[PDB]
């Protein structure tokens, strides 16, 4: 086992009984279609049946045969049409289907219907994961369809092939043989997103390079986008504002300069004419020193409809992205809110905002986005980060299924009861028209995909619930878990547990209680708490916590920057209040004296040190949980998920240590004589943050010669 | 077939009446050792043997059974002694072995017996090989002895896991997850490296950072020292000379001042304890901008006896290397040669000068360097590079076998005739205590470890040579095609060709007739023979090939640089005379009128353009050549290989059509209208050369934005 397939491992059904069952119920393969789709669907469970029923099933188009699987649309498959479905199928709509133990001519059979290709083929995938999950296809009748629009994967891939915030190795994109060399690997990058109904991937880095869009790249791009096509995944561009100037076209990029628009609508139809069902535009602009319409003056809606309107005629759309957030405000939590809310319904219909979860930057626990409950004149997308930046790279297991569920299910109050991020998302809390999720996955050419074998089940969650954004984290894990690994219960239990535990771990030795950004600058692998002195106070950590002898937490209240006047009036009044706001929240909001005391009794500076150290004890507990599986595991994903485990350790230990010790010099406070001492002082801990190795290629960081 | 095996592809033998042979002859393993070496290579025999012979053998210490293949020494196999084989057996050495089919106690054995635990490991190694290459067994009576001390592979890897000219992906070191995780890829590596006889590796980047040297390096690399050692394989690191200074431990890296020596002596005892087989250090000083002794107003000698006096008395060894030139002198040829033979004697016998094949970098064809027929009193060592820096990166195929054969057997009257590279390095020559050669192969984390399929032949030629120096690139070639890819005799012919064309088509389409060092700078990819205006006059282009409207190559006869008094006279006379010049090497010795009619016929002008069409034509014949073997090959291999090709034959056409225009706007004469004139005009050239994606993560071109 060396990760390669990841989830879609087609091994025997190892419970003899069970395997017996699915032997009887399924003899032979019926798939009277031949369109990409269909025949992509019919290949995928021929490997897959063939492997998980240890026998030689062929798709074949013949004779019903009692006992069949039988796979198509009532266009494309007279056997489903002649069972007269209607009204059930209709429900269905462009992507749903419908699984079902049924009979057509006394034969016994199988069906997965649907209204299209994709349908059968996102239904087919449903199919074989019922097996791989050991369910039984007895009485089986169910029916699925998506709850959002776009289902995307995001990629910040350079066109050097090194990916920003990439702890999977290179990109899997090798533009130096394509479009010549049609990698197998290209097919099963779009069999694994495909099995869980992603539809849509952006395969470059949102700090954009205009060469995408020239011919010379557009060529290799369409390459991809072909192998892509059969599993209905349709390619996304991030696009550079400034391209107009970049190719030495137009001396502006002025969204309202005529021969700006006139560049943007002619690369379009040079897009078009390579790929023809091209998704459209992923836009990081006026941020972080990327460019944008503000560059001239212009306003966001100003440029992102310029860019739609190129679009349109192909019926393309274009994915702007909130994060965007000026150095001068007061506050950086406040950025995005008060920098969209004022445009709120002057975004043209294929314009959708891409919104992170929350306002700052996938911080281990955050609020939710205040946009999410204010814009409802406006397409709105969520973007998740998976790749684990902040939960420590490749090192580190993370699973964030729990934090994906978290955000899903928060409760806004934006119109009454029920106004879920999740149903926001959706479309109906405020009634719009295209919906989504993108999520930055940023595998690379690793065996594995993702590095951390366990990153893989982050990917996972991800899919499933931009399916289904009810889906939970433990249902998630549940099936991966028997997809990647074992169905045995005893192995699934405390496994599953420890992947529902571990992000709430990497919360805790890292900044629990609503603290957030003590990361050292810009690698994100360590502790650095001390962060003050760059070019902008917001990349700082200090600027965050605002610690002093006194107290800690930043006051978002009325009295301090009011960030909390930007959510509906309950969230407002829920979180201002000290005797109501969430403790796992509390110093997003609130200035706190070191004395104010937790529901748990202790003070704020003891309770700090608990969360810290319960977080590594976390890890502990991991290990030991890990340890415990060595019977149910293959012995080199086992000896690795070990390995691992001990750099997390390491690493969660120097996390605690390093914080614990710092916001000690801040508070001059003791740590509590039953916690173990740290046997050195902060100037070891900040020596350590210059020394230790950031395993990423991309962040300059891991090329510093420092050492001392 | 995804390339991971490389050439240790233990599949059944596809010969029905061969395989029953084989078969007959070993039915069972016989090893009485039970060292770590010894398990290694009872564990290659077990997967080799069970693999190739289609059924279960395994490695067991019992009565001798009839047909077994039995392996040991004198000292761990009683068996093995009982032979007395006596002086035959002795003469092999600490790394030889005896492959012999014989009897013993009335059994039918073939024997793999040897003086040293290793020896059997390469002898295990060869005994496959004969199989895996369809050699007979009956009557086998064959012994090897390696020709050079040391055969070591070379790794430009950056600590962020970025390689230096890599072009087969990330760095196999995972610094991040070691030493906790010993990834299973870590002893694939050792595997295919022991195959070939290869002792030893320098794991890091030349351009040296200093960390390797520290704590949290150490602990790291001799985790992989583990990993190689059962396999023979000696860990070697390349240094920065300023490591003192770099550690904040000395104001200066003097090797002169006492606290430098002691600094130097200190860190060897902390490699030591860690490694205590550690084999020593490669250098690169004063090159470049990297860190030296000439810094200090040192030499080369100064400082490489400083470090060799620290690794003495672990008996570790220096690889200093001679890859030196200032910018100042009057021609880069001439500049090792002049700055090493003053210093000949000087160094201490536990330092090795390791010398590329020729003076300038790598080129397609260099002639010798003359340092090797000059220095009488120095240990020297072959350096040559496998990765391809300067042949394609890993889009061209170029099998590197015939560059390697051709300056190994070159002969350089040193000492007169028999004087040839292969002999001066084994010690024939001049009389030498330590003998070696490396080959910088730059390997990565892609599956195939190589890139392009074809690179893995060289690294397979370079350890074979590296055995022995006399082995010739088609039996080379021979051996790794039927290892790798088939043993159909309609198969190997016609490949092995094509193989064996492969780096003169390489030299013809970029610069044929002693032209030299045309490339775009400084990524190496693509043409730039226009290239001038460097902050280093040796840098560009134009230096190199003096093109005028009268004419062009770079005079270094007695009326020149006279770089030719640097070789010993039967040479200089040769090469310096225009009778017995050899036309691939004539520009590098003479500057002559474009009307100079060549033995073909043509004149200067002619012949260049005929040359550079020629290397084109070779290409395409290539890839007719592998088109014709799709019977033979694995679907996917074959794919790969056929598309690789394509982007070859276009970028040969870049290549080809980049520098006869160029050339032809200098010497104003027409291209022969037999000759397909080119697409586009010079410009469009130089357009390209700007604006063609750069294959390589390292090098920053590849991160170029320019579009015009
Ligand atoms: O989302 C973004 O645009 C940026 O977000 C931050 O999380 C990352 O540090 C940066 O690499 C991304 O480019
Ligand atoms: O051999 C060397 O030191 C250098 O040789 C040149 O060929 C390479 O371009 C450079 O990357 C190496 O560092
Ligand atoms: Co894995
Ligand atoms: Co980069
Ligand atoms: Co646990
Ligand atoms: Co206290
Ligand atoms: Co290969
Ligand atoms: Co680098
Ligand atoms: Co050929
Ligand atoms: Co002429």
Redesign the interface.
């Known amino acids: 086992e060396d990760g390669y397939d990841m989830w879609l491992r087609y091994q025997p059904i190892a419970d003899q009984t069970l395997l017996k069952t699915y032997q009887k119920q399924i003899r032979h393969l019926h798939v009277a279609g031949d369109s990409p789709t269909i025949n992509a669907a019919a290949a995928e469970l021929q490997r897959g049946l063939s492997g998980l029923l240890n026998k030689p099933i062929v798709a074949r188009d013949e004779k019903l045969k009692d006992y069949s699987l039988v796979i198509g649309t009532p266009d494309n498959s007279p056997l489903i049409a002649s069972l007269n479905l209607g009204e059930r199928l209709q429900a269905l709509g462009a992507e749903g289907y419908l699984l079902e133990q049924t009979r057509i001519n006394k034969r016994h059979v199988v069906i997965v219907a649907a209204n299209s290709d994709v349908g059968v083929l996102y239904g087919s995938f449903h199919l074989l994961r019922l097996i791989q999950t050991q369910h039984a296809l007895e009485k089986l009748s169910l029916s699925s369809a998506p709850r959002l629009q776009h289902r995307v994967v995001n990629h910040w891939d ?5 990916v920003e915030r990439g702890y999977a ?2 990109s899997l994109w ?4 394509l479009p ?5 690997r290209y097919t099963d990058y779009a069999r694994i997103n495909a099995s869980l109904g992603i539809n849509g991937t952006v395969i470059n880095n949102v700090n954009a ?3 995408v869009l ?1 011919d ?2 557009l060529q290799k791009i369409a390459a991809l986008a072909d192998a892509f096509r059969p599993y209905g995944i349709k390619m996304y561009l991030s696009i550079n504002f400034n391209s107009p100037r ?3 076209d137009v001396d502006t990029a002025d969204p309202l300069d005529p021969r700006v628009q006139q560049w943007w609508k002619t690369r379009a139809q040079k897009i078009y004419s390579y790929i023809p069902d091209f998704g459209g535009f992923l836009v990081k602009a006026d941020s972080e020193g990327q460019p944008g319409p503000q560059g001239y003056g212009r306003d966001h809606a100003e440029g992102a409809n310029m860019l739609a309107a190129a679009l349109k005629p192909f019926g393309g759309v274009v994915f702007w992205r909130a994060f965007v957030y000026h150095p001068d405000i007061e506050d950086r939590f406040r950025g995005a809110y008060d920098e969209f809310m004022p445009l709120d319904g002057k975004f043209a219909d294929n314009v959708i905002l891409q919104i992170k979860n929350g306002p700052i930057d996938f911080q281990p626990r955050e609020p939710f986005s205040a946009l999410f409950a204010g814009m409802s004149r406006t397409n709105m997308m969520m973007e998740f980060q998976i790749t684990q930046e902040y939960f420590g ?3 580190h297991l993370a699973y964030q299924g729990p934090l994906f569920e978290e955000s899903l299910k928060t409760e806004t109050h934006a119109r009454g009861e029920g106004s879920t991020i999740g149903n926001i998302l959706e479309g109906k809390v405020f009634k719009t028209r295209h919906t989504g999720m993108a999520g930055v996955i940023n595998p690379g ?3 594995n995909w993702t590095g951390h074998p366990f990153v893989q089940s982050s990917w996972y969650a991800f899919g499933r619930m931009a399916w289904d954004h009810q889906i939970s984290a433990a249902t998630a894990a549940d099936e991966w878990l028997r997809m990647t690994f074992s169905n045995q219960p005893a192995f699934i239990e405390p496994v599953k547990q420890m992947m529902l535990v571990s992000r709430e771990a990497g919360v805790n030795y890292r900044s629990p209680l609503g603290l957030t950004h003590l990361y050292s600058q810009g690698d994100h692998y360590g502790p650095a708490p001390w962060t003050d002195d760059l070019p902008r106070a917001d990349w700082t950590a200090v600027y965050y916590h605002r610690a002093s002898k006194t107290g800690i937490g930043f006051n978002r209240t009325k009295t301090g920057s009011n960030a909390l006047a930007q959510y509906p009036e309950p969230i407002a009044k829920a979180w201002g209040d000290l005797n109501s706001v969430p403790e796992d929240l509390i110093l997003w909001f609130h200035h706190l004296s070191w004395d104010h005391r937790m529901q748990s009794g202790r003070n704020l500076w003891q309770e700090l040190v608990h969360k810290y150290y319960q977080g590594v004890e976390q890890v502990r507990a991991m290990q030991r949980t890990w340890d415990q599986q060595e019977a149910y595991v293959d012995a ?1 994903r086992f ?2 998920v070990k ?2 485990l ?2 997390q350790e390491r690493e969660a230990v120097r996390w605690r240590n390093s914080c614990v010790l710092y916001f000690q010099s801040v508070a001059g406070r003791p740590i509590p004589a039953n916690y173990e001492q740290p046997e050195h002082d902060l100037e070891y801990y900040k020596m350590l943050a210059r ?3 950031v ?3 991309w962040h300059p960081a ?2 510093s ?1 420092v ?2």
């Open positions: 350079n066109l050097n092939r090194v190795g290179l090798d533009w130096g043989s010549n060399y049609l990698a197998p390079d205009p060469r020239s010379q790249f970049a190719f030495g790279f490749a090192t050419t690793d065996r080199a000896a690795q390995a691992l001990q750099v020394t230790t190795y395993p990423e290629p891991s090329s010669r050492l001392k």
